[PDB]
């Protein structure tokens, strides 16, 4: 996640 230290899932 640009600018963040957090994670997120990708989107097919």
């Amino acid at each position, epitope marked *: 996640v*640009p*600018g*963040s230290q957090h994670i997120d899932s990708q989107k097919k």
Partner: antibody
Amino acid sequence: QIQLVQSGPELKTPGETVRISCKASGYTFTTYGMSWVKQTPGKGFKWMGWINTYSGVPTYADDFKGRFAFSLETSASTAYLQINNLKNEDTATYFCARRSWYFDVWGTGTTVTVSS
Amino acid sequence: DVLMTQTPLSLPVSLGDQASISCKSSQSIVHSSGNTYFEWYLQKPGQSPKLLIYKVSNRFSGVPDRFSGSGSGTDFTLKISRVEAEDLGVYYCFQGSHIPFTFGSGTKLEIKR
């Protein structure tokens, strides 16, 4: 609760150096990345870059590489912005912002007025 | 950079009425992951920015359901259905998908009374 308190208004002469503190309370400082954003009176907001509070590694945006330093004191839960050889054009309110998928908490704001 | 152009610049609206504010990006703000880190902030006079919506349409915590967001790729809109006096402030969109992160010039909500 969660607070990001910033230092107060500084009046500086051109060529001077300012340091702006961002003290975070109410959450573990090393788990959210910190941004710094400039709000020029009238002209709107520019994002300045961010610093990963875990690795200590800073990212500056192209128009702020050079005279701008983000640094950290993690035992004090404080982020710092240093601006050297202060130009007139740096008169703005500066904000630290915590970001996860968004900026949910924004600092109080510090105005700097550079002026001879 | 991704230019973010926002319309209107001023939006007088009656209490009770609906209001939309749109923002157009100059290139797509879909992150390479497929997600769109797109957000709406409100700033009141003498106050720090308030998070309204993230990821195009998700209301943040404790935000009133009257606020809702929409749009795809380059065109987005925030709608306030039923404007209350308290929604006074300036609304700004932000994209956080492509570095550098950019904001819209803002839209000033004025209440017709």
